[PDB]
Structure formats: C-alpha cells, structure tokens
Amino acid sequence: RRRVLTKDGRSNVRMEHIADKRFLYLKDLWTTFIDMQWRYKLLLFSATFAGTWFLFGVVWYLVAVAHGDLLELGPPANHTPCVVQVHTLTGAFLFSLESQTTIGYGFRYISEECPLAIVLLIAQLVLTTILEIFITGTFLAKIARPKKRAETIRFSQHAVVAYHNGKLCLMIRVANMRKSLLIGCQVTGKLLQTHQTKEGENIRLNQVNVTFQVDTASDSPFLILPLTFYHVVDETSPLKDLPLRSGEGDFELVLILSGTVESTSATCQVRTSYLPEEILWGYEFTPAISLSASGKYVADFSLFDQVVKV
C-alpha cells in the first residue's frame, strides 16, 4: 500500500517543480557530491584525475609546438626545448601525469629555457591539488555516513498489543546486531492519519507524538541488549479512539530511534513504520535472552521476531 516510510526506514516522497535547483546545488557542492550516487561519484573522481592529466598534456603539446620543439620540424642540434623528450602527444600526457602525481621519473623534465612553461606547471599543480583535496574529502564523508549503520540496528517486524503490568499497552522490540554500542538512545512514536479534503487535490497530515517507555519513560543510556519499548493506551492515548481491531483503520505508526554512536560521536536515526494490519493483538514477544555457563548473557536473535499468544 501507500506508506510515508519504507519498512527499511527510507523516505517515500518525491519533491517536484523546484525552481532554481541547479544553481543552488552548484552553490553547495559539498553536500551535493556527498548526497550524489556512487556511480556518478566514482566517474567524477576518475574524470578529475585523468582529465586534468589529459588537458594539461594537450597544453604541454601545444607549447612544444609553438616553441618548435617537435622532431618532425627538424630542430637544430643546438635547439633547446621548453621540455625534454617531449615531441609527441603521448609524451606530453605522460609528463602531465608524472608531474601531477609527484612521481617524477626523470626521463622527461623541464629546462631552464621557457618560463611560461614553469608558470603553467605551477598553475597545474595548485589547481589539481585543490581538486584532489575536495574529492578526497567528499569521498571520506560519503563513506562515514551513519545511515549505513542503521542496518545493523533492527526493529521488530510486528508490534503487539497486550496487557503489561495490567495495562493495555502497545509493545515493540529493538536490537543491535553489533558489539559497537549506541548512546543516548531515545525512541519517539508519531501517528500519521489521512485527511482527505472531499477529493484528493490536497492532503494535510496530522502529527501526534506517541511516547514509548522502558523504565520510567525517560531514556536508555546504552543499547546493550534487545529491549522492549511500550506505550500505554490510556485516556490520553491518541490511539485510544482508533479501531483497535486488527486490520481496520487508515493510519501509519512511525517509529524513530535517535542515538549517538560511541566510536564516532555521530548521531544516528533509525526509522520504521507499522500499518494497521501489521499490528497484532493479544501477543507477547518471546524472550530472546538467557543465561549460559559463560557467566555471560546471551541474545538469540531468532527469538527476536518470535511471538506467543496470550
């Protein structure tokens, strides 16, 4: 069906008819390259390097021409070229490359004759350094993004409603698949209904906070183990008036876990959604924790999504 967020936590919206998109993106190149697709990004990386090499090699060839350094034109035995062993396009490209990369073999080098060549070399080095820097930065930042970390954090496929501590409550379970920890883990539940004006020329979405609690409805400093979050269906519950029967209703329950990563001090936001159908009644999650002669606690993730009727 239609859903604002994918079960995977991804957006589902398409923005359109934006004016002045191109210029704006060109203003903030950093964010642009970061958000860009991987394929075009690698293309641009390789293109930067090789195309700079190629262009400046063409320029070196032209310079060799103007100075009459080519062999075809028969330079005198006392002709000093602007650049040594550069009498062909290939050689100019190789010089450009060997320079921009700081390899510096030595078979092709500069003479003290043509200053313009020196100035050109300088410009080449400076600009290429700048571009290389910028690209390397974008690449590191695009890898470091924490979105990809959200996958090793998993929400239960199904949320379940049942009596906890005598109170009818809605419950979910969350887990971390890695040894690396989260920090300041907090959960928030949003409710999104469908407000259709008599025919759907437009839609206004109503947000309603849904508080989920663990210990005191406060926070959970660390996500050590698969935890169960629960929200109370009381007189204040915006859910109270919903069709409590399974499958009935037109609403989305979005869930958001925000927490700081320990190894990078970066924030991470996992997201997901539950539909009126996906939610289940009178079911309690199977416990997925148990002791061991280890003296250590163990988490069996096959019991994570498992549930049992009440």
Binding-site residue numbers are 10, 142, 145, 147, 184-191
CA atoms within 13 A on the CB side of 259: 27
Among 1, 2, 17, 39, interactor with ligand PIO by CB under 6 A: 39
CB 121 within 8 A of CB 104: no
DSSP letters, 48-99, are: HHHHHHHHHHHHHHHHHHHTT--STT---TTPPPSBTT--SHHHHHHHHHHH
CB 187 within 8 A of CB 177: no
Residues in 175-204 that interact with its own copies by CB under 8 A: 177-181, 183-184, 188, 190, 197, 200-204
294 binds its own copies (CB under 8 A): yes
Q: Which does 200 bind (CB under 5 to 8 A by kind): its own copies, ligand PIO, none?
A: its own copies
Closer Cβ to ligand PIO, 39 or 245, answer by number: 39
Among 13, 22, 26, 38, interactor with ligand PIO by CB under 6 A: 38
266 binds its own copies (CB under 8 A): yes
CA–CA gap between residue 193 and residue 253 (Å, rounded): 9
Closer Cβ to its own copies, 70 or 183, answer by number: 183
Q: First and final CA of the chain: distance in angstroms?
A: 29
Closer Cβ to ligand PIO, 129 or 211, answer by number: 129
CB 72 to its own copies: min, Å: 14
Q: Which does 45 bind (CB under 5 to 8 A by kind): its own copies, ligand PIO, none?
A: its own copies
Both tokens assigned to 145: 């993004």
Q: DSSP 3-state assignment of 3?
A: coil
Q: Which long-range contacts (CB under 8 A, 24 or more apart) does 200-209 make?
A: 208/238
10 binds ligand PIO (CB under 6 A): yes
CA–CA gap between residue 152 and residue 180 (Å, rounded): 10
CB 122 to ligand PIO: min, Å: 18
73 binds its own copies (CB under 8 A): no
β-bridge partners, 5:
11
CB 226 to its own copies: min, Å: 9
157 binds its own copies (CB under 8 A): no
CB 8 to its own copies: min, Å: 12
- Contact residues: ligand PIO, CB under 6 A: 10, 37-39
